[PDB]
Every structure is written in C-alpha cells, then in structure tokens.
Amino acid sequence: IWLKVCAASDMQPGTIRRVNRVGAAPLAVYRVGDQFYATEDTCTHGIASLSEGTLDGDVIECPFHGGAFNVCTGMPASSPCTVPLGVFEVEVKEGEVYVAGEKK
Amino acid sequence: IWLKVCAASDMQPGTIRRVNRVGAAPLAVYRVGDQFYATEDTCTHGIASLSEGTLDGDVIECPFHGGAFNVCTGMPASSPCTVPLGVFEVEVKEGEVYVAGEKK
Amino acid sequence: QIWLKVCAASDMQPGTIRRVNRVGAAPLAVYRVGDQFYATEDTCTHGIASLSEGTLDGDVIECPFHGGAFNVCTGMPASSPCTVPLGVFEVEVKEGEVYVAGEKKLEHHHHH
Amino acid sequence: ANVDEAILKRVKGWAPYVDAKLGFRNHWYPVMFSKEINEGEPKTLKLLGENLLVNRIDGKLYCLKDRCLHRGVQLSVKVECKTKSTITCWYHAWTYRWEDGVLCDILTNPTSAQIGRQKLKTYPVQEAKGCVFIYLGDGDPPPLARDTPPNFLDDDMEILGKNQIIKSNWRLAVENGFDPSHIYIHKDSILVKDNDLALPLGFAPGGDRKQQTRVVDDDVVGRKGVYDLIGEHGVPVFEGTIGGEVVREGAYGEKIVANDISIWLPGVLKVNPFPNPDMMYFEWYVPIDENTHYYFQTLGKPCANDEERKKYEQEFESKWKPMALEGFNNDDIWAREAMVDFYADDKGWVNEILFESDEAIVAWRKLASEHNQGIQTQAHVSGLEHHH
Amino acid sequence: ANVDEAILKRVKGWAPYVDAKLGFRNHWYPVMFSKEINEGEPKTLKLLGENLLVNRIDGKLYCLKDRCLHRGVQLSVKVECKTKSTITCWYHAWTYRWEDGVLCDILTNPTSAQIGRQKLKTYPVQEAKGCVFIYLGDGDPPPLARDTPPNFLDDDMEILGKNQIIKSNWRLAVENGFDPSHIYIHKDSILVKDNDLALPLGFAPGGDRKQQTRVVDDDVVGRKGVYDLIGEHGVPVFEGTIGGEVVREGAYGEKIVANDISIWLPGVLKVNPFPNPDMMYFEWYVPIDENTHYYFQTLGKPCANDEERKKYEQEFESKWKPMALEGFNNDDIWAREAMVDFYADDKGWVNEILFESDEAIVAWRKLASEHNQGIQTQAHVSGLEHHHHH
Amino acid sequence: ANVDEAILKRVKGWAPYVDAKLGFRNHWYPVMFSKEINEGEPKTLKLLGENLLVNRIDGKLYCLKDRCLHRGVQLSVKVECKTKSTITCWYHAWTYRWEDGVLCDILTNPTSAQIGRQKLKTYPVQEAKGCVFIYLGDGDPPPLARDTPPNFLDDDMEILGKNQIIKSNWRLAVENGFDPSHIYIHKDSILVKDNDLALPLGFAPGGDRKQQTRVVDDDVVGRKGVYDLIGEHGVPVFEGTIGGEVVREGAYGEKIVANDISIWLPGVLKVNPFPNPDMMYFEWYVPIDENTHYYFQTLGKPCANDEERKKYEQEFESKWKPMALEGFNNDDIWAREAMVDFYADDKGWVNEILFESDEAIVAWRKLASEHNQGIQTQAHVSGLEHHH
Numbered sequence A, B: 001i002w003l004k005v006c007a008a009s010d011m012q013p014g015t016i017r018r019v020n021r022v023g024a025a026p027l028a029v030y031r032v033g034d035q036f037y038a039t040e041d042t043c044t045h046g047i048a049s050l051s052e053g054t055l056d057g058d059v060i061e062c063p064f065h066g067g068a069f070n071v072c073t074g075m076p077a078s079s080p081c082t083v084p085l086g087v088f089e090v091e092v093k094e095g096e097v098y099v100a101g102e103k104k
Numbered sequence C: 001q002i003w004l005k006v007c008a009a010s011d012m013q014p015g016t017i018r019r020v021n022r023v024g025a026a027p028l029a030v031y032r033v034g035d036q037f038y039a040t041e042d043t044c045t046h047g048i049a050s051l052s053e054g055t056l057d058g059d060v061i062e063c064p065f066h067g068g069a070f071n072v073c074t075g076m077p078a079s080s081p082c083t084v085p086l087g088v089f090e091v092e093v094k095e096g097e098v099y100v101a102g103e104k105k106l107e108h109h110h111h112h
Numbered sequence D, F: 001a002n003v004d005e006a007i008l009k010r011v012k013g014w015a016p017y018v019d020a021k022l023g024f025r026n027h028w029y030p031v032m033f034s035k036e037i038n039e040g041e042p043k044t045l046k047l048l049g050e051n052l053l054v055n056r057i058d059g060k061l062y063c064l065k066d067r068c069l070h071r072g073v074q075l076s077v078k079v080e081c082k083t084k085s086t087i088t089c090w091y092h093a094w095t096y097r098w099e100d101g102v103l104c105d106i107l108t109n110p111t112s113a114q115i116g117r118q119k120l121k122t123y124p125v126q127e128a129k130g131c132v133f134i135y136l137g138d139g140d141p142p143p144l145a146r147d148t149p150p151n152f153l154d155d156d157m158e159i160l161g162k163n164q165i166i167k168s169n170w171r172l173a174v175e176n177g178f179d180p181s182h183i184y185i186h187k188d189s190i191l192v193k194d195n196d197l198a199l200p201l202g203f204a205p206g207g208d209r210k211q212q213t214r215v216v217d218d219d220v221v222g223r224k225g226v227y228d229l230i231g232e233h234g235v236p237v238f239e240g241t242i243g244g245e246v247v248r249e250g251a252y253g254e255k256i257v258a259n260d261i262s263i264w265l266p267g268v269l270k271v272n273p274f275p276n277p278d279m280m281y282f283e284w285y286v287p288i289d290e291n292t293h294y295y296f297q298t299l300g301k302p303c304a305n306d307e308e309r310k311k312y313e314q315e316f317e318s319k320w321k322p323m324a325l326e327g328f329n330n331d332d333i334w335a336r337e338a339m340v341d342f343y344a345d346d347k348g349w350v351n352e353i354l355f356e357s358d359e360a361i362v363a364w365r366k367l368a369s370e371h372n373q374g375i376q377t378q379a380h381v382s383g384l385e386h387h388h
Numbered sequence E: 001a002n003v004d005e006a007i008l009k010r011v012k013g014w015a016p017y018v019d020a021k022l023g024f025r026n027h028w029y030p031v032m033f034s035k036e037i038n039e040g041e042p043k044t045l046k047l048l049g050e051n052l053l054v055n056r057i058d059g060k061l062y063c064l065k066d067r068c069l070h071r072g073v074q075l076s077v078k079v080e081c082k083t084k085s086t087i088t089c090w091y092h093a094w095t096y097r098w099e100d101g102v103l104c105d106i107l108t109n110p111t112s113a114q115i116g117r118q119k120l121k122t123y124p125v126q127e128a129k130g131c132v133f134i135y136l137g138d139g140d141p142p143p144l145a146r147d148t149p150p151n152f153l154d155d156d157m158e159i160l161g162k163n164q165i166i167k168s169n170w171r172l173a174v175e176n177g178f179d180p181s182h183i184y185i186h187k188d189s190i191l192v193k194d195n196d197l198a199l200p201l202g203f204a205p206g207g208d209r210k211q212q213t214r215v216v217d218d219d220v221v222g223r224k225g226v227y228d229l230i231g232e233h234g235v236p237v238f239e240g241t242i243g244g245e246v247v248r249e250g251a252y253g254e255k256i257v258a259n260d261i262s263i264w265l266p267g268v269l270k271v272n273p274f275p276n277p278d279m280m281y282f283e284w285y286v287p288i289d290e291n292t293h294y295y296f297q298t299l300g301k302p303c304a305n306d307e308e309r310k311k312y313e314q315e316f317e318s319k320w321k322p323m324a325l326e327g328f329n330n331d332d333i334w335a336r337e338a339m340v341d342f343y344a345d346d347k348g349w350v351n352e353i354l355f356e357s358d359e360a361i362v363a364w365r366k367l368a369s370e371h372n373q374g375i376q377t378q379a380h381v382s383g384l385e386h387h388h389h390h
C-alpha cells in the first residue's frame, strides 16, 4: 500500500527523484523546500521523464517541450500538456519518505 | 437663434453631452474645464456619434475608427478624419448653456 | 621620401582624422587617438569610400558608406561588412612634427 | 488577437469583430449537404482554419480533426479505416475511435503507454434539412436552433441549396449580404426581369438611427441577430440622378420580395420572401480560413407532402437555382471579392468612409462583437499556448 | 521608414534613397503614350503603389485614384461613367467628378450627408511629346520641365518610343542605366555591329573624385541630376585582358555615341548622342510598386516638317526600335533583374563592394537623397496615419 | 537564431537542432555524382541556402560562391569563362580564379585598386566513390571519413545511386529515415514481395532507454551517430491488432535485412544489410534551404573487379533502382512532405506527441545538438554581420 522511498535528507531542496516500480509506471518524488510530493514520472504529453525536468517552486517543467505541471494538484501549468498528472500523496514519518502506492 | 442645452453645473469637466434637435442633425456640447464648445455630433468621416467618443483635453476621439477633432476649431486632429467639423457658437447666461441654431 | 611630413602635432585635435594625399599613390589617413598618432590607407577596403570622411570612435574608424569599421592601430576590421585588413603606416613625431611612413608595415622582421 | 493591436484599439465599437478574422468559435456551421457523405466514406474539409474529417458510420456522422497527434500529419493523406469504428494513421498506425477520438490502439507498438491516454479532438456533428452542421467549439453544444435563422428548422420547410468555396474573408460576405444599399449591383439581374420583381436602386433613409434596425438579443433559443428596417420609414429610390438628370431607373416589377432581411450569428442571412413570394431564403458565409469561406445557399419552401416536395425540387433545379442562386447572387460573389484588397491589411476597418445605410452593418458588427461565443485564433489551429 | 532602421543608420551618405523603396512622391512620371488613352475610355494603372484611373474628356486627361472612398473597391472592376464628367462606383453608386474628385451624387441615397462633403484623390496629368505624365504628389504641381532631362521638351524634338513593365525595383534600373562600366553587357549587341558603333568595354578613371561627375543643382529649371564625366580623364578600354593576355576587344566602329550620360530626378536617364550621332535617348524607370517599374523608353530626333517626322517614324519602326530599344536595351532588362535577390532584403545596400566607376552612382544616390520631393510610404497607399501633436 | 527564441527555450534538450533549420555548417555534403560534372562545364546548385558554382578544370573540381562581390548577381546568369582558370562576371567583368577565388582582373577597369584585394568565397570539394562532396564550412576541412557512415569508404565497396530535390526540410527527412516505427508505411512496397523480405509492421520495445540505442562518440575517425537497437530487446510486431483482432500482418519473407540502422552527422542514414542480405545502403538528406533537401541515395555492394562492378551496375539499373530506391523509398518521400505543415511554423517541435520507438529519434536530436560543427544562419547567406 505505502512505498517507503528514502530518507528525507537523501534529497536536497528543489530536487526530483525517480521511483521505479516493477511491472508499473515509474513515479517522481519532488522535494519542494521541506515539503515532498509525488506524481507519475512520465509526462502526459509524451515519453519524457519529469524527474529529468526543471522544478520551479511547486511546478515541474518537462525537459522535452516546456510543458509543465503543478506537482501538488497534478494539473497542467503550461501547454502543450493537457492531460492531468496522476498524483500520489506522500508522508514523512521519522525522517522517512513514504508515497502512496495507489494513484489518489 | 439659441437653444437651451443644460445647466453648466450638470456637466463635469471633460464630459460630452449630445443635443438632439427636432427636424435637424444632432450637435455635441463639450465642457473643457470651465469653457463650453459645440460641433456637429456626427463625425465627418462616417456616421458615428462623437458624443459617444472620448474627450481628452480639447480633442474629441471618434468611437468608430479613432479619428479625432479639436472641439474648439473643429479641425481634424487624428487620421482618418480630414473634413473639418462644423462648429456652433456656445453661450452661457445665468448658469445655463446655450447653443447657436446655425454653425459659425 | 621614406617619411612624409604631415603637419604639426598641435594642428590636430584628439579624436580627429587627416587625409594625406600622395603623388602617384593612394591617399593615407592619419588618426590622432588622444596623444598618439596612427595611419592607414584612406580608402576603405570594402569599397571606394574615404575613411577620413568617417567617424572616429576612440581607436576605431567607422566608414561613412556602409558603416563598416577598422581598428586604426592594427588596421583589422572592427565591424561588418569590412573583412580585408587596412595597410598600416608607421607615424612618428620629430620636433613636434607629424610624419607618416611612405611604405606600409609588413609581417616581416617583427615579433612572431 | 489576430490583428495589429493599434488597429483594434481604434475600432472601439467592434474590436472583437475586427479581431475575428478566422471566425467565431463555439457555434454551429453548415459545411456540406447530407447526400455528399456516404456510409464509410470519410470526407475532408477545413473549417475555421482547422482540417477535419467527417465519416458516416451506421448512418450517423462523426467528426475528427484531420491531424494525427503523433507527428501532425493529415490522416487523410492515406485513409486507413481498418475496422468500422476506427481510423488508423498511415504513418505509424496510431488508431483512433470515431466515437470519442480516443487512441485505442497502435499497430506498431501494442504495448505503448500512450494507448488509452491520448485523445484526438472531435467535434459534434448534426444533420438537419439535408444539411451537415458541425459545432466548431468545445464542451457540450447548444441547440442547433440557436445558430440558425427563424423558421429554417420548421417541420414542413423543404430545404434545397448549393455550396461552394469563395475567395474572400467571411465578414466581407456577411456585410455585403446585409448591406441595404448594395441592392444597386442587382439592377440588371436576370431574376429581376424574368421574375418581374420590384427593385429600387436604394433608399433615402427616414426616421432616427434607432429605427433603422431591430436587434434581437435573445430568441426563445438564444438567437442573436439584426433586422434591416431601412424600408420602414425610408423612401425607395427608383430614379438615379446625377446633377439632377435621370441616368438610371429601378425595376418597376409587380412582385415584392425581401419583406424582411435579417443577419444572425454566427453569420447567416435570411431574406423573406425570396426569390418568389412563396419561398424563404437563407445563406451562410462559413469561415474556411482567413481568405476564404463556404457560400452555403439554401432555399426553403413549405411542403405538406411528397408531391409538393417533388414539384419544388423540379422548380428549384429548373428555375430558382439558375435564376436566383446563380443569376442573382453571382454578382454578390465578385462584389465581396472586390473588397478584399482594402481590408486585407486590416486598414480598411479604419479607413472606410460609411454613409447612412451602413447603420445596418454597424448594428451587425456590434451585435457580433457583443454576442459571439469566442474568437478563433491561430493558436486554436496549431495548438493553444500558455506558459506559467 | 520603409527599411529597417538598423540599415538606414549604416548608409549615412544616402539613407533617404535607400528608404525610397516605393519611389519619390511629388514628382512627374510618364506612364503611357497619348495614343493609348482614348476619349471616354478610362484606363487603369498603378503608380507608386497607387491604383489610378485616367480618362480623356474633350481631349483633356484627368486622373482619379481608382479606389472608392466608401468600401475601398476599385471603380474599374465595373466602370459606370453615367455622364460625360463623372464616374459612378458600381457598388453603391457614389459618383465623382473627374475634374475635382468631389462626391457630387449617390444614386442609392440622394439625401446622404456625405454628398458634396467628400473628395476622391485626383492627380495632375499633362501630355507632352505624345507622352502621358502624372504628377504623383500633393498641391499645385511644379512645371514638367523640372522633372525631365535637358532638351526632351525642345519644340523640334520628335519623340518616339516604347513602354513595358519590368520585374525589379526602380532603383536597380536607374543604377544599371547610369553605370559607366555596365557597358560590358552590351559588347555583343546587334546595334554595335549593325550600326557600326564605337563602343569600349569599360573605362580606366582619371583625375580626382569630383572630376568624375558634374552634379547639377543650379539648373534654372530646377532640374536636379548628375553628368557622368568618366571618359573626360579616363582612357576607354578596348582590350580586355586576363593575366596580361587579351581575351576580349571592344567595338571599333566609326559612329561616336554616348558622349555624355546624365541621370535626373525622379529617375530618368539621358544618353547623348544615341543610338546614332544625330539622335538623343531618354529612358525613365517609373516605380509601380516595390518590385516593379515601367521602363519608359523614348528616342528623340529633330524634325522640321511632317515629311521628316514620317521618315523618322518609318526609320524608328524598321531600325531603331528593333535594333536599339530592343536589340540593345533588352540585356539591361535581365541585368537589373539579376540584382533583385541581393537587394531584396535591403542588405545589398550594405554589402555591395563598389569600385571606381561607381563613383557616378554614389553621386546620384546623394543627389537623390538630398533633392527628392518626398518619400512615398505604404501609408500613402492605404491612407495617411497620424495623431497630430503626440 | 533561425527560430523564435520562445520556442528554442522550450526545447532545452535539443535547441541547437531545432534552430538548425538551414542545416549544420562546417560538414561535408554530397551534392551530385561525379559523372554529372564534366570538364569546363560549370554547374549551379544551392547548398545550405548558399548559391554555388562547381567546375572541373584539368579533371579537378573547384567550388566558388555563385554571387559576384560587386553587385551580388549570380555569375551563372551568363557564364563567361575567358581563360581555363577563371570566370568573368557577365556584368562589369570582375574576373575570379577558380583555384582561390581571388579577384585577379577587371576587364572594365584594369587599373582598379580592387584587383587582387578582394576574394570570392570558395569551398573545398572532394570526389569519392563517384560522389561529389562539398565542405560547406570555413578553414581547413576535416577528413571526409568523419562525415560519412562506416564502410562507405571501403576500398572494394562499389557505390551507385540517385539524387533529387525533395520539398521538405532536411530534418523531417532524417527523422523519417531513422524512425523505427515508420516501417509501417512500407508494408505494401513491391520490394517486400518481389525480394522476399521479412518485414515486421513495428516493434514492442524491451529493456530500458539506454538500451534502445548506442550513441557513438568514440569512433576513431571522429564520426558521431546513433545506432537503433530497438530490435535487441524489442519484440518485432508481425500481427497488427485493433481491439485484439488481427487486421494486418507483416511480411514473412526469408531474406533478413536492416539488422542495424544508424544515423550520422551531418545527416546520413546507414541501413545494413539492405535491400538485399549482401548489400549496404546509405542515404543523405542534404539541406538546400529551409524547405528543401537533396535526397542523395547510394547503394553499396562489395566488388573485387570490373566484371563484378559491371554486373552490379546492370542489376542496379534493372532491379535495385526501380525496386528499392524507388519502389521502396518513394513512400518516404510523401511521408516527409506530410509533416511539413505541422513543423513549418516551428510549432510541431513543441506540440508533437511522441511514443516509445521515438526514443531513437530523441537520441539523434541530442547527439546532433551536441556534436554538430556549427549552425548555418541567414546571415551566413547574405553576409555575416557584426557591430563594434
């Protein structure tokens, strides 16, 4: 149900971590300041990896075409992206990062 | 010879007032500060009502294509207007505005 | 005629240009950058304009025809469309008198 | 914005209209006649600058954008409908459902994560009166009645018509059609003579500006249009004079047509009655791109049975189509084309010198500006843009 | 104005000329021959980007802009001249007087307030030497002589010629004509052989810069032009060499032609004498739009009586026109077309690499820049734009 | 700077490539076959937007820019080669040497100070395998091998081909050729049936991204390119399905071709073996201008002597050329043209929706952006600009 990803300190502020899942689409965990968020890693506009894009605040910018998403709502922030990203709630307990295994 | 327009006080500086004359073309009365002026209401470049335009200082801008005239001289101030506007004598007597029946 | 007498160093104001016509040869241009004097061919290498009729901006002369420019010290192009270097002629002041060389400098017998 | 901002600022009375070079989005538009598209035979066309594909499956029409999501090629370059309900792009085999445009399969990679996660744009299509209408807009469409002139959809109204592509912006077409004084170009029409029509050369306006037209802000179905009332208190001109001398005369026929003329959004004119006392005429000027439009002509006549419809169709083909739709309106075609240069650089919208009868055109420009459901932009064509 | 400011800033010596892509406004221009416009038969043409209509009424020519004031359609789409002195637009019947362009009537609404209050643009028209000149400018025109080359208007000068549309900016035609060294493209012209002409391949300049030309800015008639004086101190080239070996030779004929060449505003060349020792040649490069021009060719030969005039005309039709105007000048046509791409983006005006004989062209660019009577702009075409004091 | 900066900023992963609308400067490019240019017979051509003139003097090829330094006219309008080693502009007789472009004489003015002080642009030219290569770059050129695919220059490799002008930007041609899934468009090619080829419809990728290709930047001769390895872990698709039902199958021939496909800078594809198990295929997409390219097709087959070379040529003319170069690749031509509209406004580089097999193309875009030797600009064409 919940996926233990890593220690909060494993990620510097403003970075993104790709979380692979056997037999499933990869996820991207974003560290925005001291807050953590998660979405599907694949941009809904193509095959780009959002974990290889640029994070500006709480908005992830895709490396391929400049499309963007709000990592909290998963809603498109910039064209050409139109299909909402799958969001996954994350929780940090005892300095450990956990991401819901179910798209919620 | 003269027509009763309105009370000089009913007009705020920088405002326009249309004067519909029975059996004749309409006129426009402009209040530039504390001085009053009058011209034909119809723009010479078409069929627009100048009283529906914008007054900037002593220049009236037509709402149709942006043409403009100096309300004192009736001369064109902005293209596409090229034909002088008919100016009518204005007189203020005992707190009331009066406009001459015929142009100057 | 190795050295051509141009004028008195005091007859030229800083930032000015003077044309030096020569019998049987192309004209030269003498530039006064501050207290120093330089010289090159007067004819722009890009066409038939006279650089002495151009505008001097520091040590860069701008051609009046197309806006091309050169460095008066090196004679190298400073602005397009100029691409061919100007011939540079040595200038010296003897007794406060400006003299320009009759032959241009060459990549001969000098620093490597 | 499709026009220079300096120009839009000048035309304060109808900037949205002047900006609507590509037409108005979110409205229904007729593009062809039902008989032109048969079962399983996809048809191409361009509407509001967009390339579209229309197909008839089990009798019902479906509309897909004619541009593959992958590399942007038109699917129509080489149509491949491999199953009754889909169309496969000829390039990399991305396959879409006509029903909802969903990318349901990719023959070149059946395991692609894109399958079921992308959707090709679709538009609502409806057939009425033998005409095919496409809602070039987003979201659930409004009733077709909103975008059609009154009575066009009347149960007993039998519609017949003609369609073709004309080289002029759609607006020049609209304005010419609703232009009260353009009647002058029809003075020598064969219809006027052969159908003994009364036709003045123009009108000497009467009454106030407000009485020259009748704007309809809302109909029972939300229609938006303007009626030309220049003939209400205006004086029909039958003798054209120059320096007091008569140089031309109107037509003193006995048949009175065009009792009322009205223009409706998104851009369709209704002339009643026309070209004969017992008929009704409607014509659309559909935006194809900024330089062309469909000139969709329709003639209507109430018919109670099949015998009347049969008789009507015979009269249409043998008389009304060639004498009216062609013999009359052909002059409207080159007239529209004559205004192209003046407005091509968008400067005509500033330099035009209007006279009295143009009150009708002005009323249309502002009604259109105030009630259109959206301005089509080049971005809608290539792909809406937006950066956070 | 009509060109990128970055480029104009670079051509400090003749920016106005480089900016005059559409030609110079306020000058007279020949557009057709008198015999081409008949009584009551309006003719269309485009001059400086403007569509015009010319009509002959009672023998006199009148010019009206071919664009109705109402919806901007060309009146010529369907000409309706309902009375001798007017033209009625085919659309809504706005009617204009040929003599002053005043909107005198409107058949679709004889009560319109616009009647008598609007005026369609008119342009002065004058016929001279069987040529139709239009003053494409505003206000009362200057005398025609100001915009014509010396002697063109001489009483005894019989003028004959041809006109056609050429695909190149007018300036490229001008500089091709006034070019001293372009004479090379004419080395194989039939006129050279068939009329036994003396024609060098080029010229080796001599003297100083100012001696290369004669700038005329003191002409009592107001004429403004430049005389090409390259042959005055420059030895003509009759033997073209490469590496010292002669590869081409000029023509060694008896007839001496082109003693003097001059270019005059607004853009007319005079070659004297040419194509024969007893004749004078004049050619105009009239701007139609930024890409085209009328190549108005005129040939003059003094004549005292009708007999001489006819002999001249017969001679014109049989020898001059086909051997000179065509056999010689046709090479000038594709020559100016060849320069289009280089100057199309306006960059040619910066990257051109000129040589000695272009000194004449440079003088012309400066004279044209300083003495033109106005820069035609696209705004003049669509409708002047302005907000007065701003 | 050939593309709107806003677009370039969006494609951070390969901006240089998207900007290279006119191609990459400082690379060798084939433009014609040796047998097409004869002794003292000047040929005109446009490469990377520049008009060029090629000539053969004493058997050696020379290339001069086809634009007189004087008034910028093309010398080719009326070629005048007065001496064997020079060309004289037909206008004012400025004469240049083919060998170094130096303005050596001026017939209209032998005393001109410009003589010997101006130089017309020249470009290195090299003939190899019967192909004429021009180095459209500045300074000393690198070894030809750097800009040619592996084995093209092998001693025994006999090269035969065809060349033509295609109306599409060069990059669209490159991506179509290196496209793993476009193979779908060749399913009905006569080459497949007539040469008993095994040809799937597409590929279901396997393994990670890194494994989808092999980026080559360690080649000793300096060539830079990408190998398409989608077939190493990817399940070739032979049964195309829609809704799970087979609607089309690939070709089950015995001959195995295209085991390896690679694209190399400046823009040449290598398919091996093809179109036969014992042959090698290479094709260039040379930029002529922003809208067109030369489609330089070459087929190589090892030959030990003249008897074999002659045999191969006969097979080429009667089979390979009509069956492969044309019967197979003709579809690649209209395919390329079909993508023009989408990418013409440069918006397609932003709105394209890619899928898994495009991983190869993306690798090429990055390699090209990183290893190209320069971006050709319109300034290179009109004349480089720079202000002090």
Ligand SMILES: c1ccc2c(c1)[nH]c1ccccc12
Residues within 6 Å of the ligand: E177, E178, E179, E180, E183, E257, E258, E261, E269, E271, E274, E281
């Ligand atoms: C030299 C000699 C003759 C001519 C010339 C320059 N330029 C010309 C232009 C037109 C006609 C003849 C000539």
Ligand SMILES: c1ccc2c(c1)[nH]c1ccccc12
Residues within 6 Å of the ligand: F177, F178, F183, F257, F258, F261, F269, F271, F274
């Ligand atoms: C498989 C089989 C043949 C080809 C291919 C993939 N890709 C190609 C690109 C150009 C020419 C031929 C081919």
Ligand code: FES
Residues within 6 Å of the ligand: A043, A044, A045, A046, A047, A048, A062, A063, A064, A065, A066, A067, A068, A079, A080, A081, F350
């Ligand atoms: S693949 Fe992410 S914006 Fe296109």
Ligand code: FES
Residues within 6 Å of the ligand: B043, B044, B045, B046, B047, B048, B062, B063, B064, B065, B066, B067, B068, B080, B081
């Ligand atoms: S109607 Fe007033 S500016 Fe045109």
Ligand code: FES
Residues within 6 Å of the ligand: C044, C045, C046, C047, C048, C049, C063, C064, C065, C066, C067, C068, C069, C080, C081, C082, E350
């Ligand atoms: S002549 Fe000096 S820049 Fe051209």
Ligand code: FES
Residues within 6 Å of the ligand: D068, D069, D070, D071, D072, D073, D089, D090, D091, D092, D093, D094
């Ligand atoms: S462009 Fe249609 S599937 Fe690739």
Ligand code: FES
Residues within 6 Å of the ligand: E068, E069, E070, E071, E072, E073, E089, E090, E091, E092, E093, E094
């Ligand atoms: S456009 Fe000429 S009268 Fe209306």
Ligand code: FES
Residues within 6 Å of the ligand: F068, F069, F070, F071, F072, F073, F089, F090, F091, F092, F093, F094
């Ligand atoms: S344009 Fe070539 S010599 Fe003048």
Ligand SMILES: [Fe+2]
Residues within 6 Å of the ligand: D176, D177, D182, D183, D186, D329, D332
């Ligand atoms: Fe009509």
Ligand SMILES: [Fe+2]
Residues within 6 Å of the ligand: E176, E177, E182, E186, E329, E332
């Ligand atoms: Fe000539």
Ligand SMILES: [Fe+2]
Residues within 6 Å of the ligand: F176, F177, F182, F183, F186, F329, F332
């Ligand atoms: Fe292919």
